[PDB]
């Protein structure tokens, strides 16, 4: 039943008595459900240490991964260039999933095309698919560039991207001068961030490999900034703002900020902003190239150091206080511009906030996950705040990155209880937070289920989730946030301290039970 | 086939099989066999509602995968699949069956998932369903539906053929093709069981493998999604002689008509119960119409089964595919929002719902009035422009 | 008892068994506590409509007021000027309370002095106190200006501020040219915002009344912006940023943003930034004066219109979409500058966020309170969002302001169930949210207790509090937020929609009971 | 560090003042001599503040409503006058209580007369009677009403005593008028005195002829403990594990009933001498009840106070005291072993109101910390007599210190930690010196007793050794 004045959606409509009776009869008559005592026993077993050993003995089964496949990162990288059309050579369902994923995260239109390779292409390849797709895509969506990645089927059948593009240009499907950079993005190697690296390196190779004769390092008095796989618009904004404050000439290569934040004014813009082709062509002339996320831009670093001859600085991600300081000092050294008083005042205000919130932030325990650079920056920032990142999970991290994070943890007294897990998924982390319960989790929306599981064990066992990372699906407009620089550090500190304060308020809201600690002033 | 490089909404066979058909089976564990991407992008993407303890006896919103790497591609993943099945048995003992949904590389590397499934199922006495639903097969999710239906037929539907212990009643019906998006199947089931009928089976939405096995015992098969289940309905008519009929619970007129049509297949007691249910629900949807039709009368709708509710609210559907409003997916939602037209997702019901039934009609009308008459759409042009 | 590995603070230390037994023994043996059945009966009665009628029949008792006294706002106004010391003529307890209040809201030092009027001055007046205090303050804290307000003691006694300042200057206690603007701030008249208006009018009159002979309107080509009583630093910043983007000369009179956000860099800054005396002197030369919060700047508006001859534009607070739009059109008309593409893009992005979140924001009910302009801006924004502000409470609002808010509500279909309450306090609002339960409340930290009360009735009766306004004591660094302009509307919208989504997540986190609606995507 | 250096520092700090202010403020700064008993020959206190010098003192209303009367949970306390005084003092003090707020407890609530101009011009006695009627109507489970006068009440000639008499007689309710106008006295100290006199004259003698309370030889009353963060509960659990019966608590988590039962106790354990010595002396002279001061800050003071209290009773209480001390020795020994190596040798400067500047020195010394400067907002000369022997030789003492004076002393002495109120916290935090709130315990605590000592050590270590203090200087500056 429904009431017209108060219409109930599925919650709490399905909590009504008739629906409960119908569901109970369905379950007891036809579902053959296990007894509720058996379900409770199995759940309690899954929350135990022995189940944790069984879970960590896994070698072939992945449950709830914390990563995606390369072409998603390749598409995100391609979206960062001016009037550039992402094009995945292979199966269409991959492109549908990529567009849906980015649509749900950014709440924005996401442009990506596929050449719709079918069973026939499993025999003679997708050469005809490449020709028809390039021709039709250029004719219909009129991009200045088409950036080509691959699906897993194309990598398995061994499609040669370069030869297919050359034949498409030779047979007149597309003009020979039309820029079509490509990158092989095998979805069974690495993850989405690897795809971002591959796509960016392919585009840089396309525009700069054959034009190095006239290039002189530091002739346009600019610094190249390579952001990497980045799903916070505020991060691009803060890097650009901090560089402009310093008066430092910069080129943000693969900037998707404009196309991921198109205003609603009555018209749909397929393309907006982004790195121009002239910027990519002039990139070797810069003083240097700074990689914002060095741990998934290895191929890009190799190309920039080996072709552009840029001495890429060994910089951490500009996350937290110390690493933002190092980034600003290195930018000052490269460009010669002194750090302005505005940035010094912003740093002092961040330090003021840390000082104000340190009592509530001290000793708190966190289980966190995400991409390597973001995770390591979060670990550094938590160590700066006196927090304890007990469970550090990076499904797409490697041994060298784990070594770096362990070195970071060893330098701080708050990294004593920390452990880094590479190759593990969110089921491993669910076991970890059941057996060694932290105060909070930090991660994407997929962690919301872990919290639910903890709440099933008991309110005292519940580990609340803080949504920093990618993807965030169950909250709106969190992609607009910042995690880089002093501004990102301030936002993250505010989020952490206020999450602690909401949790304390919830725990002390019981009148005559716990409300003696329901302080007005905190 | 789809024209290359034109930007299709269309999904793949894997999305049709795992995402649509097999996935909502709650007590079964579904393995996305292959690289991580397909499983990760489809995890909890569809709102096929269910009742259970996720991770213990229900696994719908979880993502199990083989996480294929280069070594698995080069040397095959059959040994990996067998080890994965052993680990699934070890860590999820209350699973009542395993499905193995193939991804694109599985077919191309010559993996024999059928032999692995047969051997492991014989060893563990468990039903393991190999589904050859590689994404490159076919041109859309329709072949995924067909392959999933064939898998259901070959591996699940007929394992209780000899069984007779089930006590069948003359009013046994099975809901087929209703995936319980936002609780739609529950809202249909409440009306059907208010009619005196007994929904023995309801798959895939909030569906159990046991009630899939109990489907050949029902007296009538009520098919909502004809496209994804016509194959199994036809096979069930040919093999078990069970009549299957289509129904529509979208909008008060359509659900009244469907209830009468379904009751006409049974004796007069069911027809009397149908009349009682229709009379009982008449004031509710009548009041909903009185409230919301003046707000939505004379409004044109474009879309890409549901026309009945729109017309019952006073709307005019001037566009459909496979204006004052556009109803489509998430990939077109923001594109149409930026051109300034109010938009509704007709795949997840904009995370609202249910929409089927008399209860769902109130939610549907509220949502249409909310989106179409929202003040945000009149604030598009800056006053200085 | 404590374990040194996990030391418990008061929560949850006092939940231990021995503390529970000790508290029970104390209550049963010595407190003569009412029976728990009687207590529950009385609470349930307080949640009813009959109790609401009794509560709203109040005429002499005020319970949990939503306002402060004039000298607090006067001190805040004085804080907005360069090297200006706030000086409250009267008793020191008021100054201690003002400084503590602003310290807890801003988490920053707040400088203010008193002349310590003692009962020996309760008969003879505070002339000697004024002389000694002015001399001591100027000698010790070296301000370029001393801005004088009064406590209730001095107002009741009837101390003549003008004569006392003149006698202090005449007797050589302070130099004749030293600026000592003053204002009478009776704490029994109006509220803190009235004090801000009185202090600003005193300073403007001091610096301008005797020098209007050479003033010409529009000669400096600037616009005067009067913020009023403002406790969000982001509001000052957003006004300055929007005006700078438009290329509009402006003079933010009483800008306390710098002094309330000093960096923590090893030194203490008593003074920072602020409106200069040259700016205040040249203010009459401006084209016009725009009041950000006109409903508590009546005296300032009267003075500006009658003395500076500025035709003050009838403008609402720049809150929400339409009012920010109107503010930008008016500023463009006054200054002649066009509205740049960046502000148009920001408006379009705010509209985009509105269209993204309208499904979750539509039909939600809110009980809100605060200062008059803040709450009318909040009501207007909520109407723009499709929300229903069912309970609008303004303890310091008047009848004409209520007429304005009712007119605002009448223009919207979503203000049909909205009621405006002036002269009512938070106990009235508690009765309102019990008898007519909204989805959320919007207000200061004082609302948290209301939420606790609602939670005592039941989880289905709990009304969550969204902390927007002044003061916020139980959360950290929310004073850095923005509520004005497109950016302020963005922040408010994000907070509202994520509050709704967090509440929905909490309601549907019950495993096998409500988690059927625990959607990953929302 | 040396006495001559401290005196020279005092002189150069005083150099900025005008002549009258410098002459007055010279008498309130001193170099501690622990061998001096009469501090009147060394320091001067309980005098009016110098005008316009950023004093930290509150008012008499703060000392009465905010300190003594407010913590009483079953009583409703009316801030009589305009809205400011009640609004700024609402829930700002963490005097913890157990109860149902709004029904039978009203501590965190703000009741006020909300004086308008008409109430100033024509008086508010009629408004006060109407307000009492409204309070009775809307809060039936209150056990009494107190009327704390704000500044205008005394000046406009209001007679709250007559209204309290009439309404109490009519409603059979204990209505206590308190003339605690802010302009009275020089600080919160006269507020304490006025509140104590009000308690004596309106509450304490209610059950003088009542003999229905079964009294035991072990009846004690805790006086001057306002349960800041639960401190009174941490003291009470220790006292009751010792075999004593805590009949009353003054006034944190205190009820009017146990205040009325205080004349029946055998001993008065006074924690805050400054705020409740008046009522302790009155109870001694009227009911013959002995009173003794006790300190529960840190294990050393806690053990010494427990033994001193147990020495007032039979040998069974002494045996139970030894049992409690033996029980709690491992806990605070582990706390010390964990935290003292982190805090050993660190110098602390304190400036709190009237008792804690000397009471918390033992707890700090239990962790190896040294207090180099202490001072009071509103203490009297007896408090300084008690303080001088507690502080070390040649340490700094300040009475009613100014903001400028405190800043200059901190800049010169450069302590490792400062413990003061919210008005100094951010000043000294921007200066790079770790700060602890010694009024509200930085929204932590309790600090009394052994559990309180564990919390105190954790807080001191967490703030003093926080990494944020190594980051105030930009690496490029
Ligand atoms: S199965 Fe089909 S796209 Fe028939 S693949 Fe798709 S839950 Fe749609 S129009 Mo999403 S043929 Fe169902 C469908 Fe219809 S996932 Fe749902 S809404 S009624
Ligand atoms: S009552 Fe006094 S100022 Fe003795 S007015 Fe003050 S809760 Fe202080 S040093 Mo705030 S004489 Fe208590 C005090 Fe001490 S409010 Fe608390 S901490 S032990
Ligand atoms: S059409 Fe369908 S969704 Fe596409 S791959 Fe093929 S089965 Fe799968 Fe998979 S990991 Fe990523 S998303 Fe692909 S590139 Fe491969
Ligand atoms: S010394 Fe003390 S706190 Fe001051 S007034 Fe007097 S009793 Fe009160 Fe009150 S309303 Fe505001 S804060 Fe004052 S100016 Fe009057
Ligand atoms: Fe959007
Ligand atoms: Fe601060």
mmCIF file of C-alpha atoms in Angstrom, chain C residues 1-2 4 7-10 13-14 18-19 22-23 25-26 30-34 38-39 42-43 45 51 54-55 57-69 72 85 87 91-93 96-101 103-104 107-109 111-120 122 129 132-133 135-137 139-142 152-153 156-157 187-190 262-268 270 395 426-427 446 449 452-453 456, chain D residues 16-18 20-21 48-55 57-59 61-62 73 82-85 87-90 92 96 98 100-104 109-117 120 127 130-131 134-135 137-141 143 151-152 155-156 183-186 207 229-230 233-234 236-237 240 245-247 249 253 255 257-258 261 328 331 334-335 338-339 403-404 407 422-423 426-427 430-431 445-446 451 454-455 458 472:
data_model
loop_
_atom_site.group_PDB
_atom_site.id
_atom_site.type_symbol
_atom_site.label_atom_id
_atom_site.label_comp_id
_atom_site.label_asym_id
_atom_site.label_seq_id
_atom_site.Cartn_x
_atom_site.Cartn_y
_atom_site.Cartn_z
ATOM 1 C CA UNK C 1 40.572 1.143 36.027
ATOM 2 C CA UNK C 2 42.684 1.810 32.929
ATOM 3 C CA UNK C 4 47.886 1.716 29.460
ATOM 4 C CA UNK C 7 43.357 4.477 27.730
ATOM 5 C CA UNK C 8 39.680 5.448 27.830
ATOM 6 C CA UNK C 9 38.538 9.053 28.084
ATOM 7 C CA UNK C 10 35.298 9.806 29.962
ATOM 8 C CA UNK C 13 35.476 4.867 30.668
ATOM 9 C CA UNK C 14 32.359 5.644 32.685
ATOM 10 C CA UNK C 18 32.264 -0.340 38.446
ATOM 11 C CA UNK C 19 31.414 3.203 37.324
ATOM 12 C CA UNK C 22 28.847 3.652 41.559
ATOM 13 C CA UNK C 23 26.516 5.952 39.612
ATOM 14 C CA UNK C 25 24.434 3.733 44.089
ATOM 15 C CA UNK C 26 24.785 7.528 44.106
ATOM 16 C CA UNK C 30 21.309 10.415 47.610
ATOM 17 C CA UNK C 31 19.941 12.041 44.442
ATOM 18 C CA UNK C 32 16.244 11.400 45.234
ATOM 19 C CA UNK C 33 15.772 10.980 41.495
ATOM 20 C CA UNK C 34 12.284 10.726 40.061
ATOM 21 C CA UNK C 38 7.850 9.207 35.545
ATOM 22 C CA UNK C 39 10.825 10.628 33.630
ATOM 23 C CA UNK C 42 7.293 13.556 31.220
ATOM 24 C CA UNK C 43 9.599 13.342 28.189
ATOM 25 C CA UNK C 45 4.578 14.538 27.172
ATOM 26 C CA UNK C 51 3.250 20.638 25.333
ATOM 27 C CA UNK C 54 2.052 25.375 26.434
ATOM 28 C CA UNK C 55 5.552 26.156 25.126
ATOM 29 C CA UNK C 57 2.092 30.326 25.150
ATOM 30 C CA UNK C 58 5.347 31.486 26.766
ATOM 31 C CA UNK C 59 5.674 35.239 27.250
ATOM 32 C CA UNK C 60 8.424 35.746 29.870
ATOM 33 C CA UNK C 61 10.725 32.689 29.847
ATOM 34 C CA UNK C 62 13.327 32.191 27.115
ATOM 35 C CA UNK C 63 14.804 28.695 26.804
ATOM 36 C CA UNK C 64 17.864 28.091 24.611
ATOM 37 C CA UNK C 65 17.953 31.425 22.734
ATOM 38 C CA UNK C 66 19.231 31.653 19.170
ATOM 39 C CA UNK C 67 20.861 35.079 19.530
ATOM 40 C CA UNK C 68 23.601 36.953 21.381
ATOM 41 C CA UNK C 69 24.002 40.501 22.708
ATOM 42 C CA UNK C 72 29.690 40.755 20.561
ATOM 43 C CA UNK C 85 41.443 47.240 19.154
ATOM 44 C CA UNK C 87 37.209 48.231 23.578
ATOM 45 C CA UNK C 91 32.504 45.079 33.078
ATOM 46 C CA UNK C 92 35.238 42.604 32.137
ATOM 47 C CA UNK C 93 33.070 39.470 32.326
ATOM 48 C CA UNK C 96 35.859 37.392 28.640
ATOM 49 C CA UNK C 97 32.656 35.802 27.329
ATOM 50 C CA UNK C 98 32.914 37.524 23.921
ATOM 51 C CA UNK C 99 36.506 36.407 23.463
ATOM 52 C CA UNK C 100 35.680 32.843 24.523
ATOM 53 C CA UNK C 101 32.705 32.671 22.133
ATOM 54 C CA UNK C 103 37.686 31.693 20.145
ATOM 55 C CA UNK C 104 35.514 28.588 20.122
ATOM 56 C CA UNK C 107 39.678 28.586 16.785
ATOM 57 C CA UNK C 108 41.717 31.793 16.548
ATOM 58 C CA UNK C 109 42.885 34.467 18.992
ATOM 59 C CA UNK C 111 41.635 40.552 20.909
ATOM 60 C CA UNK C 112 39.328 42.753 22.984
ATOM 61 C CA UNK C 113 39.741 44.929 26.069
ATOM 62 C CA UNK C 114 37.516 46.251 28.847
ATOM 63 C CA UNK C 115 37.975 49.100 31.310
ATOM 64 C CA UNK C 116 36.857 46.844 34.200
ATOM 65 C CA UNK C 117 33.960 48.855 35.578
ATOM 66 C CA UNK C 118 33.496 47.836 39.226
ATOM 67 C CA UNK C 119 30.627 48.558 41.628
ATOM 68 C CA UNK C 120 32.470 51.698 42.760
ATOM 69 C CA UNK C 122 28.207 51.676 39.377
ATOM 70 C CA UNK C 129 37.770 53.917 33.805
ATOM 71 C CA UNK C 132 42.770 54.968 32.276
ATOM 72 C CA UNK C 133 41.622 52.255 29.881
ATOM 73 C CA UNK C 135 45.677 55.278 27.929
ATOM 74 C CA UNK C 136 46.585 51.732 29.007
ATOM 75 C CA UNK C 137 45.276 50.124 25.814
ATOM 76 C CA UNK C 139 50.333 52.236 25.510
ATOM 77 C CA UNK C 140 50.276 48.443 25.817
ATOM 78 C CA UNK C 141 48.711 47.057 22.635
ATOM 79 C CA UNK C 142 49.524 50.010 20.351
ATOM 80 C CA UNK C 152 24.671 46.494 29.612
ATOM 81 C CA UNK C 153 26.075 47.969 32.840
ATOM 82 C CA UNK C 156 21.942 51.177 32.232
ATOM 83 C CA UNK C 157 24.144 53.586 34.205
ATOM 84 C CA UNK C 187 22.551 44.315 25.097
ATOM 85 C CA UNK C 188 18.829 44.566 25.930
ATOM 86 C CA UNK C 189 18.062 45.997 22.463
ATOM 87 C CA UNK C 190 18.254 43.864 19.347
ATOM 88 C CA UNK C 262 46.423 34.256 10.657
ATOM 89 C CA UNK C 263 48.996 31.568 9.791
ATOM 90 C CA UNK C 264 50.718 29.527 12.490
ATOM 91 C CA UNK C 265 54.336 30.339 11.628
ATOM 92 C CA UNK C 266 55.917 30.777 15.061
ATOM 93 C CA UNK C 267 54.682 34.321 15.730
ATOM 94 C CA UNK C 268 51.456 35.801 17.083
ATOM 95 C CA UNK C 270 47.364 40.659 17.179
ATOM 96 C CA UNK C 395 15.045 34.758 17.267
ATOM 97 C CA UNK C 426 15.251 26.491 20.244
ATOM 98 C CA UNK C 427 12.786 24.989 22.747
ATOM 99 C CA UNK C 446 23.011 24.352 19.691
ATOM 100 C CA UNK C 449 20.830 18.726 21.631
ATOM 101 C CA UNK C 452 19.595 14.075 20.839
ATOM 102 C CA UNK C 453 16.087 14.707 22.148
ATOM 103 C CA UNK C 456 15.368 9.655 22.531
ATOM 104 C CA UNK D 16 55.580 49.456 28.592
ATOM 105 C CA UNK D 17 52.871 50.395 31.098
ATOM 106 C CA UNK D 18 51.933 53.961 32.043
ATOM 107 C CA UNK D 20 49.763 54.081 37.420
ATOM 108 C CA UNK D 21 49.368 50.766 35.595
ATOM 109 C CA UNK D 48 40.679 45.227 40.640
ATOM 110 C CA UNK D 49 42.004 44.765 37.124
ATOM 111 C CA UNK D 50 43.772 47.597 35.348
ATOM 112 C CA UNK D 51 41.443 49.093 32.708
ATOM 113 C CA UNK D 52 42.152 48.312 29.064
ATOM 114 C CA UNK D 53 44.832 45.659 29.618
ATOM 115 C CA UNK D 54 43.151 42.470 28.278
ATOM 116 C CA UNK D 55 42.397 40.840 31.602
ATOM 117 C CA UNK D 57 39.115 37.315 34.561
ATOM 118 C CA UNK D 58 35.405 36.714 34.268
ATOM 119 C CA UNK D 59 32.688 38.267 36.396
ATOM 120 C CA UNK D 61 27.944 35.942 37.439
ATOM 121 C CA UNK D 62 30.519 33.579 35.934
ATOM 122 C CA UNK D 73 21.404 19.196 37.607
ATOM 123 C CA UNK D 82 19.620 40.342 28.911
ATOM 124 C CA UNK D 83 20.461 37.362 26.715
ATOM 125 C CA UNK D 84 24.244 37.613 26.375
ATOM 126 C CA UNK D 85 25.391 36.297 29.749
ATOM 127 C CA UNK D 87 24.105 32.574 25.848
ATOM 128 C CA UNK D 88 27.889 32.766 26.235
ATOM 129 C CA UNK D 89 27.925 30.510 29.317
ATOM 130 C CA UNK D 90 25.630 27.796 27.934
ATOM 131 C CA UNK D 92 30.807 26.062 27.845
ATOM 132 C CA UNK D 96 29.440 16.392 33.720
ATOM 133 C CA UNK D 98 23.829 12.011 34.607
ATOM 134 C CA UNK D 100 17.564 13.375 31.142
ATOM 135 C CA UNK D 101 18.225 16.884 29.862
ATOM 136 C CA UNK D 102 15.027 18.908 29.623
ATOM 137 C CA UNK D 103 13.041 16.543 31.868
ATOM 138 C CA UNK D 104 14.855 16.021 35.183
ATOM 139 C CA UNK D 109 20.135 24.370 28.938
ATOM 140 C CA UNK D 110 19.960 28.176 28.803
ATOM 141 C CA UNK D 111 17.127 29.711 30.824
ATOM 142 C CA UNK D 112 17.051 33.502 30.775
ATOM 143 C CA UNK D 113 14.708 36.437 31.266
ATOM 144 C CA UNK D 114 15.810 37.958 27.919
ATOM 145 C CA UNK D 115 15.593 41.536 29.168
ATOM 146 C CA UNK D 116 14.428 44.121 26.645
ATOM 147 C CA UNK D 117 14.444 47.899 27.003
ATOM 148 C CA UNK D 120 15.315 47.922 32.012
ATOM 149 C CA UNK D 127 8.566 39.315 34.349
ATOM 150 C CA UNK D 130 5.714 35.192 35.185
ATOM 151 C CA UNK D 131 8.924 33.386 34.202
ATOM 152 C CA UNK D 134 6.254 29.365 33.022
ATOM 153 C CA UNK D 135 9.193 27.290 34.302
ATOM 154 C CA UNK D 137 4.384 24.811 33.837
ATOM 155 C CA UNK D 138 6.909 23.546 31.292
ATOM 156 C CA UNK D 139 9.414 21.672 33.510
ATOM 157 C CA UNK D 140 7.426 19.949 36.278
ATOM 158 C CA UNK D 141 10.288 17.648 37.336
ATOM 159 C CA UNK D 143 13.496 20.318 42.081
ATOM 160 C CA UNK D 151 24.651 43.253 35.642
ATOM 161 C CA UNK D 152 21.468 45.338 35.049
ATOM 162 C CA UNK D 155 21.509 48.718 38.831
ATOM 163 C CA UNK D 156 17.796 49.037 37.974
ATOM 164 C CA UNK D 183 30.101 44.416 38.241
ATOM 165 C CA UNK D 184 30.252 43.091 41.814
ATOM 166 C CA UNK D 185 33.714 42.359 43.108
ATOM 167 C CA UNK D 186 36.703 42.101 40.808
ATOM 168 C CA UNK D 207 16.597 19.536 56.535
ATOM 169 C CA UNK D 229 34.946 15.684 32.230
ATOM 170 C CA UNK D 230 33.951 13.278 34.994
ATOM 171 C CA UNK D 233 33.187 10.448 39.517
ATOM 172 C CA UNK D 234 36.854 9.433 39.293
ATOM 173 C CA UNK D 236 34.163 9.261 44.161
ATOM 174 C CA UNK D 237 34.935 5.744 42.939
ATOM 175 C CA UNK D 240 33.920 4.534 47.911
ATOM 176 C CA UNK D 245 29.940 6.728 51.584
ATOM 177 C CA UNK D 246 29.864 9.886 49.457
ATOM 178 C CA UNK D 247 26.531 11.392 50.474
ATOM 179 C CA UNK D 249 28.863 16.105 45.555
ATOM 180 C CA UNK D 253 26.582 15.913 38.903
ATOM 181 C CA UNK D 255 21.454 17.305 43.133
ATOM 182 C CA UNK D 257 18.819 16.747 47.677
ATOM 183 C CA UNK D 258 22.416 15.753 48.417
ATOM 184 C CA UNK D 261 22.005 16.105 53.029
ATOM 185 C CA UNK D 328 45.889 0.991 41.609
ATOM 186 C CA UNK D 331 48.065 0.945 36.631
ATOM 187 C CA UNK D 334 52.555 1.456 33.914
ATOM 188 C CA UNK D 335 51.261 4.894 32.893
ATOM 189 C CA UNK D 338 55.091 4.607 29.373
ATOM 190 C CA UNK D 339 54.818 8.395 29.408
ATOM 191 C CA UNK D 403 47.687 39.205 27.754
ATOM 192 C CA UNK D 404 50.763 41.308 27.010
ATOM 193 C CA UNK D 407 52.947 36.766 26.002
ATOM 194 C CA UNK D 422 40.718 29.155 25.621
ATOM 195 C CA UNK D 423 41.689 32.838 25.331
ATOM 196 C CA UNK D 426 45.532 29.914 19.909
ATOM 197 C CA UNK D 427 47.825 32.813 20.815
ATOM 198 C CA UNK D 430 50.520 30.264 16.669
ATOM 199 C CA UNK D 431 53.742 30.937 18.605
ATOM 200 C CA UNK D 445 39.553 13.857 30.815
ATOM 201 C CA UNK D 446 38.858 13.234 33.621
ATOM 202 C CA UNK D 451 42.235 6.822 35.626
ATOM 203 C CA UNK D 454 46.293 7.920 32.757
ATOM 204 C CA UNK D 455 44.210 10.258 30.588
ATOM 205 C CA UNK D 458 48.220 10.521 27.424
ATOM 206 C CA UNK D 472 55.544 25.843 11.797
#
